[PDB]
Amino acid sequence: MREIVHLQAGQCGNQIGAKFWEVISDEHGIDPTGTYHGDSDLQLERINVYYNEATGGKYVPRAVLVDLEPGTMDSVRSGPFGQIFRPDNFVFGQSGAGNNWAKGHYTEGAELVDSVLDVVRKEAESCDCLQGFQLTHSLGGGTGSGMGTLLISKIREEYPDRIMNTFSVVPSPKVSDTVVEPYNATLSVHQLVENTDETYCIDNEALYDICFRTLKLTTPTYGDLNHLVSATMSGVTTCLRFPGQLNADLRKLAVNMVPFPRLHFFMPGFAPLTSRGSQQYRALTVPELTQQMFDAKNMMAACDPRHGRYLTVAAVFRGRMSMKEVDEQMLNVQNKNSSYFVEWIPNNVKTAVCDIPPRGLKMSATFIGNSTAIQELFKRISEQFTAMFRRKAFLHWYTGEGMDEMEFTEAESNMNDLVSEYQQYQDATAEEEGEFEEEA
């Protein structure tokens, strides 16, 4: 009745999507075959949000998997929960992108998108009242960014009055293993700033930092890395599927968190993360959840919010809890930190409460922060782009595929304008009519 159509782009998007579907299948009580075996009647009240009914009491996800190499599709299919996806929603090309944004955007990603958009349009038209589209991809590769941005642009052209959420795995400063990674990132942010409703920046260095210094795991594999992302994906849309005291859907979160259409880059975090040996020392109640959300270590991006100002903050709590404590902690943090919040928006913090907790817990919380300290990410990508671009390194791979050198210059200019507008919205006074209120 409010459906979210899932799109997974590239190898990173495919593995994150497989982990996310594994998470919410156990949330809704779905076996690897597809049928339902649960204990509550509230698990099938709102199940059409992500699932599609089949015969014999089976449910299949409303997801479209996209790749330019069939190996990751084979790996996803041969997984534990790989028999739930419909076989017609795997769209894989035969020749890879080869870590090239031009290959993903003009040469090899221009013929796969008709076949992708056929499935996307049939899944969008099958819904009752569509709520939005979701995308999971990474800006460091070829298939995820180079064809994912083109899919985003075509979807935004076809369905303008909808919601477009994206989960972007932005480049890492220290963990960077590919050389053309700043090229791909800089040529993707110009698309994401122009035709996207919400963007969540997720960073592998921050995921490794949380998996090492908080969870205290000896072996932080990509399964542990993707569980952290899947928890946030579940928590941001739990208010659609489960009842609560104060509901808030993605449209409401976007309205309250996005003050201007060019400012939609958010930072995520997940609240109850503890270790097996150190969970006996901690009672995880609402002050602990708020404390661990607002702790600057817990961000999933490689940006420290102490350097900037929190433009807007939203948080979705899960479980049975009293609303007095929920309102009290979020008033107290704003009263304590007076210089970390912008002063031309009063009550920067939005609260939502859902009733049913996630698997294995009794209470939980999720934090999404629109901060101005995201501009240092774009500044770092720009300073690593210019260093290669002045010497014209790795430029023939891009310019032999129908590209021009003017597109790189315009990408630089729009990234500079983005960081300039973030800086001007940071260093802005609230007690002034500047120049447009000359009507008096």
Binding site: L217, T218, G277, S278
Partner: protein
């Protein structure tokens, strides 16, 4: 030979594998060391200078 005083594996210095045997998916952080039993047996802790 005495293992009462020899230093054993650290719980705070090197939080990394290849130090403890077996398969463990979390760090130790439990506060029980290898020579704790023999240290408790040889050196008992019973009150102090004050009290009967």
């Amino acid at each position: 030979y005495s293992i009462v005083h020899r230093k054993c594996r650290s719980q705070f210095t090197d939080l990394n594998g290849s130090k403890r045997f077996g398969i463990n998916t979390w760090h130790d952080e439990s506060g029980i060391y290898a020579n704790s039993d023999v240290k408790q047996k040889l050196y008992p802790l019973t009150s102090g200078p004050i009290v009967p």
